[PDB]
Design an enzyme around this catalytic site. Sequence first.
Site, PDB file in Angstrom:
ATOM      1  N   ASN A  37       9.956   4.960  16.652  1.00  0.00           N
ATOM      2  CA  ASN A  37      11.255   5.641  16.494  1.00  0.00           C
ATOM      3  C   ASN A  37      11.286   6.642  15.335  1.00  0.00           C
ATOM      4  OD1 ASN A  37      11.525   2.820  15.062  1.00  0.00           O
ATOM      5  ND2 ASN A  37      13.084   4.113  14.090  1.00  0.00           N
ATOM      6  N   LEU A  61      -1.887   9.354  16.903  1.00  0.00           N
ATOM      7  CA  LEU A  61      -2.525   8.046  16.732  1.00  0.00           C
ATOM      8  C   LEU A  61      -1.566   6.958  17.208  1.00  0.00           C
ATOM      9  CD1 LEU A  61      -3.911   8.805  13.143  1.00  0.00           C
ATOM     10  CD2 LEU A  61      -5.256   8.720  15.259  1.00  0.00           C
ATOM     11  N   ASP A 115       5.686  -8.081   7.031  1.00  0.00           N
ATOM     12  CA  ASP A 115       5.212  -7.729   8.318  1.00  0.00           C
ATOM     13  C   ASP A 115       3.720  -7.794   8.238  1.00  0.00           C
ATOM     14  OD1 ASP A 115       5.962  -6.964  10.906  1.00  0.00           O
ATOM     15  OD2 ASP A 115       5.642  -4.936  10.517  1.00  0.00           O
ATOM     16  N   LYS A 149       2.330  10.227   8.653  1.00  0.00           N
ATOM     17  CA  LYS A 149       3.468   9.692   9.405  1.00  0.00           C
ATOM     18  C   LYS A 149       4.619  10.710   9.419  1.00  0.00           C
ATOM     19  CE  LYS A 149       6.537   5.636   9.613  1.00  0.00           C
ATOM     20  NZ  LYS A 149       6.933   4.349   8.977  1.00  0.00           N
TER      21      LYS A 149
HETATM   22  C1  X5G Z   1       2.082   3.959   9.146  1.00  0.00           C
HETATM   23  C2  X5G Z   1       0.688   4.008   9.702  1.00  0.00           C
HETATM   24  C3  X5G Z   1      -0.358   4.494   9.116  1.00  0.00           C
HETATM   25  N1  X5G Z   1      -1.347   4.379   9.957  1.00  0.00           N
HETATM   26  C4  X5G Z   1      -2.564   4.717   9.670  1.00  0.00           C
HETATM   27  C5  X5G Z   1      -2.875   4.842   8.354  1.00  0.00           C
HETATM   28  C6  X5G Z   1      -4.153   5.145   8.008  1.00  0.00           C
HETATM   29  N2  X5G Z   1      -5.024   5.281   8.934  1.00  0.00           N
HETATM   30  C7  X5G Z   1      -4.692   5.139  10.183  1.00  0.00           C
HETATM   31  N3  X5G Z   1      -5.617   5.286  11.056  1.00  0.00           N
HETATM   32  C8  X5G Z   1      -5.518   4.908  12.275  1.00  0.00           C
HETATM   33  C9  X5G Z   1      -4.326   4.478  12.739  1.00  0.00           C
HETATM   34  C10 X5G Z   1      -4.236   4.071  14.037  1.00  0.00           C
HETATM   35  C11 X5G Z   1      -2.910   3.590  14.561  1.00  0.00           C
HETATM   36  C12 X5G Z   1      -5.330   4.104  14.843  1.00  0.00           C
HETATM   37  O1  X5G Z   1      -5.204   3.734  16.093  1.00  0.00           O
HETATM   38  C13 X5G Z   1      -4.835   4.908  16.577  1.00  0.00           C
HETATM   39  C14 X5G Z   1      -6.128   4.767  17.208  1.00  0.00           C
HETATM   40  N4  X5G Z   1      -5.789   3.946  18.312  1.00  0.00           N
HETATM   41  C15 X5G Z   1      -6.864   4.113  19.281  1.00  0.00           C
HETATM   42  C16 X5G Z   1      -6.189   4.319  20.627  1.00  0.00           C
HETATM   43  C17 X5G Z   1      -4.705   4.352  20.331  1.00  0.00           C
HETATM   44  C18 X5G Z   1      -4.670   4.684  18.858  1.00  0.00           C
HETATM   45  C19 X5G Z   1      -6.524   4.561  14.376  1.00  0.00           C
HETATM   46  C20 X5G Z   1      -7.735   4.615  15.252  1.00  0.00           C
HETATM   47  C21 X5G Z   1      -6.620   4.959  13.074  1.00  0.00           C
HETATM   48  N5  X5G Z   1      -3.490   4.859  10.579  1.00  0.00           N
HETATM   49  C22 X5G Z   1      -0.952   3.765  11.042  1.00  0.00           C
HETATM   50  C23 X5G Z   1       0.315   3.553  10.939  1.00  0.00           C
HETATM   51  C24 X5G Z   1       1.129   2.905  12.008  1.00  0.00           C
HETATM   52  N6  X5G Z   1       0.893   1.480  11.968  1.00  0.00           N
HETATM   53  C25 X5G Z   1      -0.477   1.128  12.254  1.00  0.00           C
HETATM   54  C26 X5G Z   1       0.151  -0.075  12.866  1.00  0.00           C
HETATM   55  O2  X5G Z   1      -0.519  -0.419  14.015  1.00  0.00           O
HETATM   56  C27 X5G Z   1       1.226   0.877  13.231  1.00  0.00           C
END
Ligand code: X5G
Length: 265
Positions: free
Chosen positions: A19, A15, A128, A40
């Site tokens: 780092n 997703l 943040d 994560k």
């Molecule tokens: C620590 C952490 C927990 N999560 C989480 C926590 C719970 N749920 C999700 N679900 C989720 C998370 C992301 C980053 C996401 O985008 C990935 C989908 N994007 C579509 C194209 C590139 C990726 C989608 C569609 C669903 N992420 C994300 C992170 C990272 N953070 C999100 C922030 O942007 C960076």
Amino acid sequence: VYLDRKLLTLEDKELGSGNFGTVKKGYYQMKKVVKTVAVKILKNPALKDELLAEANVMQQLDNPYIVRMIGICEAESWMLVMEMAELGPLNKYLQQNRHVKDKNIIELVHQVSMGMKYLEESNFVHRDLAARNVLLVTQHYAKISDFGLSKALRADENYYKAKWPVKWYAPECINYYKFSSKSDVWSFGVLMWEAFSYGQKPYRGMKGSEVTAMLEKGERMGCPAGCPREMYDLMNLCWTYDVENRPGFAAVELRLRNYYYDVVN
Ligand SMILES: Cc1cn(-c2ccnc(Nc3cc(C)c(OCCN4CCCC4)c(C)c3)n2)cc1CN1CC(O)C1
């Protein structure tokens, strides 16, 4: 709050990537029903304490509009297991959903304000708070994510004192290194502008010092296209220069609450 590795099943797809390592979709096997989870995963210098700190913050938190932690899993690499918000980052959703009506954006940011209202009551600073760190479960349901820079405040003080998102940061964070819930209210103002701009980057093309310089003259980001005038006032109210004069999330939530229900009525 320690999870069994043989019950978890991770996807090959990533997703997100930093780092730390990765964030991957997966399935944790509960009593009978299988729950979908965002995990994560870690990539080796003793930055494992940083992840434990994030998990420790989320362990204490318990709110409808905050990303829930299921648990930690020690196996091959450290893993912070969380519930899955399927639609993803708010900025990226609104970028590719321009049809999303302004009523819907008020609903989504008000939900974020209630999560921060809880965060303020619970005496935690996020540090943040951006549109990238708001994740959508549905089009009408948001959660605040990423507690990597979050700090629990002591019972006597009411600020934390210290690679920064300067565009989301209040003057006192830049000048004095002092992070309070009022500093998160500043960030919520930038988060609001982001949401009503449909995931457009704040202070476009500007460097941190140029942003710091702009804000010192009293110049603030303009009202984005189609944004209600009462919502723009709240952004400028969130962008109060003086820390003491700036409102807390109690006030920010209360204005967003009242305004929201004069739209749906
Ligand atoms: C620590 C952490 C927990 N999560 C989480 C926590 C719970 N749920 C999700 N679900 C989720 C998370 C992301 C980053 C996401 O985008 C990935 C989908 N994007 C579509 C194209 C590139 C990726 C989608 C569609 C669903 N992420 C994300 C992170 C990272 N953070 C999100 C922030 O942007 C960076």
